[PDB]
Amino acid sequence: GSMASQDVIKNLSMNFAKPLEDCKKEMDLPDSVTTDFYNFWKEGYEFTNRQTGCAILCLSSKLELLDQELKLHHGKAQEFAKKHGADDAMAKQLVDLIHGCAQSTPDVADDPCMKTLNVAKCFKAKIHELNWAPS
């Protein structure tokens, strides 16, 4: 049921966010990133600023999920989902959601942080639409 899928997204989310303290101390990120992460799955929550996108990129890099251009490595992202309990179909669906969001969010501003935050907002909305967002 939707609760089982939510549990996969919870496991993914918690493991993804584990190194946030390390990222904050390495990059001098504002404490607003920690607030945005606490509220990441809260329905109707809007993110604070582009530094939350920088935090998402730092967490992605620590988990070796980014390519050299700071874009998601689709294969590594799929495998990350499977290691946290996604079946191959669910993992492929999650990567397709991120890919669709990235195609809707070209990096016109040469700002990987703001582009990443916009992709994350789009991904969050798609996950709520599927009732896959954990409380």
Author numbering: 24 to 158
Question: Can you quote the paper on this entry?
Answer:
Here, we solved three structures of the cotton bollworm HarmPBP1 at different pH values and its complex with ligand, Z-9-hexadecenal. The HarmPBP1 scaffold contains three conserved disulfide bonds linking α-helices α1 and α3 (Cys46-Cys81), α3 and α6 (Cys77-Cys136), and α5 and α6 (Cys124-Cys145), encapsulating the hydrophobic pocket for pheromones binding. The structure of HarmPBP1 was found to contain a hydrophobic cavity formed by the five helices α1, α3, α4, α5, and α6.
The apo-HarmPBP1 structure at pH 7.5 was determined by molecular replacement and refined to a resolution of 1.3 Å in the space group of P21, with an Rwork of 17.9% and an Rfree of 19.8%. The structure was built in the electron density map, except for the C-terminal residues 159-170. Surprisingly, the structural similarity between apo-HarmPBP1 and all other apo-GOBPs or apo-PBPs was lower as the RMSD was larger than 1.5 Å, revealing a distinct conformation of apo-HarmPBP1 compared with other apo-PBPs. The most significant structural differences between apo-HarmPBP1 and other known insect PBPs were observed at the C terminus. The last 12 residues were missed in the structure of apo-HarmPBP1, which might have been a result of crystal packing. The first helix of HarmPBP1 occupied the C-terminal helix position of the above two structures. In the apo-HarmPBP1, there was a channel through the ligand binding pocket. In the apo-HarmPBP1 structure, part of the Lys138 side chain was flexible. Moreover, the arrangements of both proteins in the crystal packing were different, revealing that the little structural difference was not caused by experimental errors.
